[PDB]
Each structure stands twice: as C-alpha cells, then as structure tokens.
Amino acid sequence: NPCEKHSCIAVIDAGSTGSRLHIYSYDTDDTNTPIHIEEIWNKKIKPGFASIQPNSVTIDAYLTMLLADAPIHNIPVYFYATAGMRLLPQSQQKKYYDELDYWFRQQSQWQLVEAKTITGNDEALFDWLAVNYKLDTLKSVQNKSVGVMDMGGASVQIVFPMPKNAEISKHNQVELNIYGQNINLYVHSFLGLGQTEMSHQFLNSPSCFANDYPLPDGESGQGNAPSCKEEVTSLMNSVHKVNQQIQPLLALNPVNEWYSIGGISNLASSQLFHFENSELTNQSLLQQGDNQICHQQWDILNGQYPDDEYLYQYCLLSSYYYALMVDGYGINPNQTIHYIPPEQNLDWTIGVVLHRAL
Amino acid sequence: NPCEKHSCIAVIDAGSTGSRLHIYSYDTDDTNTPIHIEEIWNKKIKPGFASIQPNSVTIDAYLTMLLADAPIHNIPVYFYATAGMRLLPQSQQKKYYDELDYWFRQQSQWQLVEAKTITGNDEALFDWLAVNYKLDTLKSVQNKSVGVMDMGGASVQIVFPMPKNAEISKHNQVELNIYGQNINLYVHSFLGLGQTEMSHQFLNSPSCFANDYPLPDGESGQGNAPSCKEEVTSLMNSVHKVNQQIQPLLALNPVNEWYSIGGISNLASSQLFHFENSELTNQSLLQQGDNQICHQQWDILNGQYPDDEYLYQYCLLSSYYYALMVDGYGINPNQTIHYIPPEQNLDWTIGVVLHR
Ligand SMILES: Nc1ncnc2c1ncn2[C@@H]1O[C@H](COP(=O)(O)O)[C@@H](O)[C@H]1O
Ligand SMILES: Nc1ncnc2c1ncn2[C@@H]1O[C@H](COP(=O)(O)O)[C@@H](O)[C@H]1O
Ligand SMILES: [Cl-]
Ligand SMILES: [Cl-]
Ligand SMILES: [Cl-]
Ligand SMILES: [Mg+2]
Numbered sequence: 066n067p068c069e070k071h072s073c074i075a076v077i078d079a080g081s082t083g084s085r086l087h088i089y090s091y092d093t094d095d096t097n098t099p100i101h102i103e104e105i106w107n108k109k110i111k112p113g114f115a116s117i118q119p120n121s122v123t124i125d126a127y128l129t130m131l132l133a134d135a136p137i138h139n140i141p142v143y144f145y146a147t148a149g150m151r152l153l154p155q156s157q158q159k160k161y162y163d164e165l166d167y168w169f170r171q172q173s174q175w176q177l178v179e180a181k182t183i184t185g186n187d188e189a190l191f192d193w194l195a196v197n198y199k200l201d202t203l204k205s206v207q208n209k210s211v212g213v214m215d216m217g218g219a220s221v222q223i224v225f226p227m228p229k230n231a232e233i234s235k236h237n238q239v240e241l242n243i244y245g246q247n248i249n250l251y252v253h254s255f256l257g258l259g260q261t262e263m264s265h266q267f268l269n270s271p272s273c274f275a276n277d278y279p280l281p282d283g284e285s286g287q288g289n290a291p292s293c294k295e296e297v298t299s300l301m302n303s304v305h306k307v308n309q310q311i312q313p314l315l316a317l318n319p320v321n322e323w324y325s326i327g328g329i330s331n332l333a334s335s336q337l338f339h340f341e342n343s344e345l346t347n348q349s350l351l352q353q354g355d356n357q358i359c360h361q362q363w364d365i366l367n368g369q370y371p372d373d374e375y376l377y378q379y380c381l382l383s384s385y386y387y388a389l390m391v392d393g394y395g396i397n398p399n400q401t402i403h404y405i406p407p408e409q410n411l412d413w414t415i416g417v418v419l420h421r422a423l
Numbered sequence: 424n425p426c427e428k429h430s431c432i433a434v435i436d437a438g439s440t441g442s443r444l445h446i447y448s449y450d451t452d453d454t455n456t457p458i459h460i461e462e463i464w465n466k467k468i469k470p471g472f473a474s475i476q477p478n479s480v481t482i483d484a485y486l487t488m489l490l491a492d493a494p495i496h497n498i499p500v501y502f503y504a505t506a507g508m509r510l511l512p513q514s515q516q517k518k519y520y521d522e523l524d525y526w527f528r529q530q531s532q533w534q535l536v537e538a539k540t541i542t543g544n545d546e547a548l549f550d551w552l553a554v555n556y557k558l559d560t561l562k563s564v565q566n567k568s569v570g571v572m573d574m575g576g577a578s579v580q581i582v583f584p585m586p587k588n589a590e591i592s593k594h595n596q597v598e599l600n601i602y603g604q605n606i607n608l609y610v611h612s613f614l615g616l617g618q619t620e621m622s623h624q625f626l627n628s629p630s631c632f633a634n635d636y637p638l639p640d641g642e643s644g645q646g647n648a649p650s651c652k653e654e655v656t657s658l659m660n661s662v663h664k665v666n667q668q669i670q671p672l673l674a675l676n677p678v679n680e681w682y683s684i685g686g687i688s689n690l691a692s693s694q695l696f697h698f699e700n701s702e703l704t705n706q707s708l709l710q711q712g713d714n715q716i717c718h719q720q721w722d723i724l725n726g727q728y729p730d731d732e733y734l735y736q737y738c739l740l741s742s743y744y745y746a747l748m749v750d751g752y753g754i755n756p757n758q759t760i761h762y763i764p765p766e767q768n769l770d771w772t773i774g775v776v777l778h779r
C-alpha cells in the first residue's frame with residue numbers, strides 16, 4: 066500500500082460516456098503542493114452516470130461497480146461530473162447526488178469530500194493543469210504558450226494562456242499561482258458540441274458515413290469528408306458562433322504548442338489512422354478520414370477492421386474535429402496538434418489534485 | 424375479457440422519452456382490415472428504452488414493469504422503437520433486442536411477433552394512419568388534404584397526401600391501400616430535431632429561458648421568444664435544411680387541415696397556455712410563450728407550478744415549435760393547428776393495428 070508512505074486521493078471523472086476512478090499517491094513540496102503524482106489505481110465503467118435511471122438501486126449498483134473493488138478505501142474522494150450532468154436541470158441532478166451521498170454514507174472507509182457537477186470553465190482549468198503537469202511545464206516560467214483542447218461526449222473545452230483581460234468575461238479567465246509562478250488562462254467550454262451530442266444532428270447525412278453504411282432513415286452513406294465537415298461547421302458557427310467567440314482572441318494570444326485529450330486521442334491512435342510522434346494535423350486528419358473511411362464500401366471495411374466499435378463514426382469524427390478546430394477555433398489546418406496516448410489515462414483529474422492545494 | 428370474442432394485439436411504442444404499452448381489441452371487415460379498434464389497456468413507463476443500461480438485469484426489470492399488471496395476457500406483441508433507438512448504431516441496438524427477445528421467449532404469457540426499430544418514414548406513415556383513423560377519414564374517399572405532425576423527443580415527423588413523383592426519393596413516398604382505396608403520402612422524419620436533442624444545443628442561450636433561470640454556464644435566463652426562435656431556426660434551416668426540403672412540397676400539394684401529436688399536446692394543455700377547441704396558432708403559441716414564461720421571473724414561476732417537470736423548457740419549446748412549423752415547414756403563423764388532447768393516449772400505434 067503506497068498510501069502508508071504517501072498522501073493519497075481518489076478522484077472520479079464522471080464524464081458523459083462513462084466514469085473513471087483514479088487513486089493517486091503523491092508527495093508535496095515546501096508549500097504543500099503535490100509533486101510525484103502517480104496513478105496507483107484506475108477503473109473505468111460505461112455508460113455515463115447522468116445516463117442511468119435515477120433510482121436508488123440503479124445508482125447504488127453503478128457506484129458499487131465503479132468503487133467497491135478499489136484496493137484502498139480510507140482516503141478523500143472527489144466525485145466530479147462534467148457535461149453529461151450539465152444537460153439535466155438542477156432538480157434532476159439532485160436525485161443522483163442525494164442517492165450518491167447516501168451510498169457513500171453506507172460504505173465504511175471512504176471519505177467523500179465533494180460530489181458535484183463542475184462548471185465547463187473549471188473542467189477547462191483542470192484540463193490545462195493535468196496536461197501541463199504531465200509535460201513537466203509547470204515548475205518553471207514558459208517561453209511559449211501551451212494550449213489544451215478536450216474533446217468530450219457532450220462538451221468540448223479550449224484553454225490557453227492569456228494575460229488578465231478586461232475585455233473578456235471574468236468567468237472566462239482564471240488566475241493561479243503554482244510552483245511559485247503566476248499564470249492567467251482563458252477558459253471556455255461549449256455544451257452540445259461534444260461528439261455524442263453533435264453526432265445526433267448528422268446521423269442521416271450520407272456525406273458523413275462510409276459508402277452503403279445503413280443510415281437510420283433507410284438511405285445509404287455516400288461519404289465525403291469536405292462536405293460532412295461543411296455540414297458540421299454549420300452547427301459550430303451558424304448555431305453556436307464558435308468562430309466569433311474564439312478566433313479573434315486566439316489571434317491576439319497565439320499558442321505555440323497544442324495538446325489534445327478526449328475522443329481525438331482514441332481516434333488518432335486507432336488502427337485506421339497513421340500519425341507519427343503522437344501528433345497530427347487537421348489537414349492530414351481530414352484527408353485520412355476521407356480516403357480511409359468516407360470513400361470505402363462499409364460492409365468491406367467493417368469486415369477488414371472487426372475490432373473497433375467506433376469505426377462507423379470515423380468519417381463523421383474526422384470531419385467534426387476539423388470543423389471544430391479549423392473552422393471554429395481558426396487553427397491552421399497545417400498546424401501540429403499533439404495528442405496524449407490513450408494508454409496514459411490522462412484526463413483532467415490530475416488538475417483536481419493540484420488545484421485544491423493552491 | 425373482449426379478447427375471447429375479438430382479435431387483440433399489444434403494441435408498444437418505445438419512444439425516446441418513455442414506452443407506452445397499448446392493448447387493442449378489433450374486428451375485421453371484408454378484406455380482413457381492422458375496424459372497431461378500441462384501446463383496452465394503456466401503461467406508460469419512463470425513461471426511454473434506448474436510454475437504459477443494455478444489460479439483462481436492467482432490460483428485464485424495465486420490461487417486467489411495463490407489462491406487469493396487464494389485465495389481459497396470452498396475446499401477440501409488437502415492440503417498435505423510434506428515434507431514441509435510431510441514435511444508436513445497429514451493433515448497440517442489437518444488445519437491447521437480443522436481451523428483449525430472450526426475456527419474451529421465457530414469458531409464456533406474451534407472444535412476441537416483432538421487436539425492431541422502425542424508420543422515421545415508417546413512423547410518419549403510422550402517425551398519419553393513427554390520426555386519420557381517429558378522425559374517421561380512412562373509410563371513404565376524402566375531399567380535403569389532412570396533414571399530420573408528430574413532435575417527439577429525438578425526431579419529428581411530417582406526412583401529408585402527395586401524387587407520385589419520380590424525382591423524389593422513393594423512401595419519402597408511400598402508396599397505401601386501405602379500406603379498398605388508394606392513398607399516396609409524402610413522409611419525412613428529421614432526426615436530432617426532436618425536443619430533447621434540439622434542446623441540448625441551446626441550454627446556454629439566455630433568450631431561451633425564463634428570467635434568472637440558472638443556465639449550466641452560470642449565466643441567467645433573459646427570455647425573448649422571438650430571439651430564441653431565431654436561434655432555433657439556424658438549427659432547422661442552416662443545419663438541417665428543413666425549409667428547402669419541405670416548403671416547396673407544401674406549395675405544390677396544399678394541406679387543408681393540420682393535426683399534431685406528441686409533446687406539443689402536452690405543452691398546449693398546460694395551465695400557462697389558453698387555447699380553445701384543442702387548437703392553436705403558431706403566432707399565439709409564440710406570444711403566449713413569450714408573455715407567460717420567457718418574460719417571467721423563474722423562481723416565481725417555478726414556485727407557482729411545482730408539479731410541472733417540463734416548465735423550465737416552455738420558453739424554448741414555444742420558440743422551437745414556431746421555428747419548426749413556420750420557419751421550417753413554411754406554415755402560416757396564423758393557420759389553425761389541431762393538437763390531440765393528451766388524455767386520448769393517441770400515438771402512432773393505431774397505425775400498426777391497421778397496417779402490418
Ligand atoms: N475510438 C474513439 N474514437 C473517437 N472517440 C472516442 C473513442 N473512444 C472514446 N471516444 C470519445 O471520447 C469522449 C470522452 O468524453 P467524456 O465521456 O465526456 O469524458 C466521448 O465522446 C467518447 O465517445
Ligand atoms: N408534459 C410535457 N410537456 C412538453 N413536452 C412533453 C411533455 N411530456 C412529454 N413531452 C414530450 O413528448 C415527446 C414524446 O416523444 P417520444 O418519447 O419520442 O415518443 C418528447 O419530446 C417528450 O419530452
Ligand atoms: Cl439504467
Ligand atoms: Cl430516421
Ligand atoms: Cl456549460
Ligand atoms: Mg471528459
């Protein structure tokens with residue numbers, strides 16, 4: 066048990082498509098800020114917590130599956146839900162949290178600290194801290210601006226350094242002091258533009274599916290990534306105005322290196338895509354989705370690649386990522402976007418470990 | 424038990440927000456077409472079947488609760504899901520049906536005939552047949568054109584009479600023979616344009632919520648139905664091209680009367696709205712929504728109507744219905760729209776009784 070010799074904390078990422086428990090060991094520097102954060106336990110379950118029947122047996126059984134076989138129980142627990150919960154009104158969210166609190170009260174060891182729906186802006190903050198912790202970029206003052214994107218099921222986040230800015234909402238900015246350095250960041254989350262939610266607007270778009278993919282309306286896929294992308298852009302910009310909100314700011318605060326986490330790490334890492342050095346460009350991403358999924362015959366492709374439950378979405382997802390990043394945020398199609406490998410289990414929960422101590 | 428003396432079948436509408444079991448008794452006419460269709464049992468459960476965990480304990484307990492206390496047994500069952508299921512790929516849908524087929528196989532008191540996801544066009548056909556059955560307009564050749572809309576959680580349907588084209592997808596045309604007469608219909612379903620799916624695009628729009636309603640991003644409602652309606656219209660037309668697809672067809676094949684079923688019956692029936700004769704106009708709906716919800720203070724309104732689980736959405740909903748029927752379908756904002764009262768339990772399931 067590492068927790069006999071180190072501080073330990075459990076943090077649950079209750080995301081829109083599933084929940085992930087992490088138990089971290091850590092030490093602390095002279096200011097009691099965590100260092101040496103190591104993941105000592107990970108368990109993931111599907112589907113998302115906000116998706117399940119809000120009754121007591123359903124909620125208790127889910128929590129049981131997530132938590133009951135954890136090797137270490139007598140530690141602080143944070144259960145933080147993101148955009149899956151944000152789709153529900155507060156009265157309906159309360160049902161899940163009242164049951165969750167009771168479940169925890171009936172367990173011996175666990176110290177529930179907080180169980181709540183975090184704002185998209187806090188999610189963004191935790192996204193940035195988690196990625197910069199992993200990159201080892203927090204302990205000294207950086208020459209260069211690191212931006213972070215998190216592609217979730219129901220929201221997406223974008224977060225990048227920006228000096229305190231009176232022209233921008235207080236709610237879209239965060240100042241923090243960590244490892245003795247002061248950092249101001251712009252933060253934004255877009256609810257409804259996550260992959261699952263976005264996809265439900267385009268399931269009958271033949272451009273967004275491989276040739277002869279059976280669309281729900283009985284028609285056939287006729288894939289064309291540029292056309293699928295255009296359709297997605299209409300939701301990004303004509304509907305949500307992502308371009309108007311993000312591009313003028315990004316122009317004035319250029320990012321030197323972009324890191325992405327969430328569904329895009331899984332796509333980019335799949336067997337259908339070819340990228341080197343865990344990094345991609347949007348131009349390459351759209352060209353590979355177009356050639357390798359959109360223009361392929363669905364029954365043939367599905368037989369060639371049997372193991373990937375997401376295969377059928379890859380024409381649409383490659384088009385959406387481009388739509389979001391290039392037409393929405395205004396990122397150059399030829400700009401390198403780093404993604405973190407899925408095996409690293411990096412989500413924004415490390416940000417919680419660090420942020421509570423500041 | 425009328426099923427000793429008359430044909431009966433059970434039809435389950437598995438919608439995006441709930442499932443409704445109907446048992447119907449009926450006789451058959453000269454050609455074995457049903458007549459004298461009567462609903463003899465209704466039971467509804469929430470939430471939608473496609474929203475629950477697709478495992479044995481969960482599926483089995485849902486179906487047990489839906490069928491428990493049914494006063495009649497040992498009859499054929501049709502389980503037909505709509506857009507909630509169409510959101511899922513066939514591989515995930517199969518996890519639900521594999522378990523549901525097995526559960527039924529073990530129940531000696533129910534004979535499962537078919538359990539499947541119907542297309543939005545099938546659903547639009549059944550929507551039209553169900554309303555026109557209730558209106559008594561199928562047995563004889565009709566002089567007027569009757570149009571039907573179904574406002575669901577994940578898709579919306581529109582269906583109205585239309586001559587053979589050749590250039591229109593065969594998938595959007597249906598030739599129906601019933602009571603010995605021939606009827607040609609245009610059908611269309613718009614997936615993602617149902618109430619729940621649409622609403623997930625606008626939860627941070629202040630124009631769409633009563634004053635001070637807490638939005639998930641921490642901003643406050645500031646209701647303005649005309650503005651909210653313009654936002655929703657961008658999803659209708661800029662994204663979905665509803666107007667380009669529907670408006671030309673209605674100009675070429677006019678509808679004399681409109682009937683709507685689904686969530687709009689519930690909204691129109693709310694104590695906040697005032698409509699007579701089970702009919703509304705889009706102008707009136709948008710004005711009442713704007714006046715009675717958008718422009719009201721949320722805490723006051725929530726405390727005044729504590730029972731109503733849909734209230735927080737009524738400003739959005741008023742705006743969305745207008746955006747859909749006027750900006751989308753091209754309906755005059757002063758045209759009468761009949762809605763079927765909710766207590767009638769009318770969904771498209773009557774359509775399945777009539778047309779297998
Ligand atoms: N192979 C994959 N390709 C694309 N997206 C994926 C893959 N696996 C998981 N995801 C997405 O990753 C996102 C994680 O979001 P969340 O559950 O909201 O934290 C969801 O939208 C998942 O569906
Ligand atoms: N009381 C209500 N007020 C407004 N809409 C409702 C109400 N009850 C049910 N609905 C909607 O009725 C529609 C039924 O669609 P479905 O469940 O897809 O058959 C869904 O959008 C429901 O959310
Ligand atoms: Cl469930
Ligand atoms: Cl469909
Ligand atoms: Cl939000
Ligand atoms: Mg997430």
Ligand SMILES: [Mg+2]
Nearest residue numbers: 438439505575
């Ligand atoms: Mg329905």
Ligand SMILES: [Mg+2]
Nearest residue numbers: 527528530533
């Ligand atoms: Mg049986």
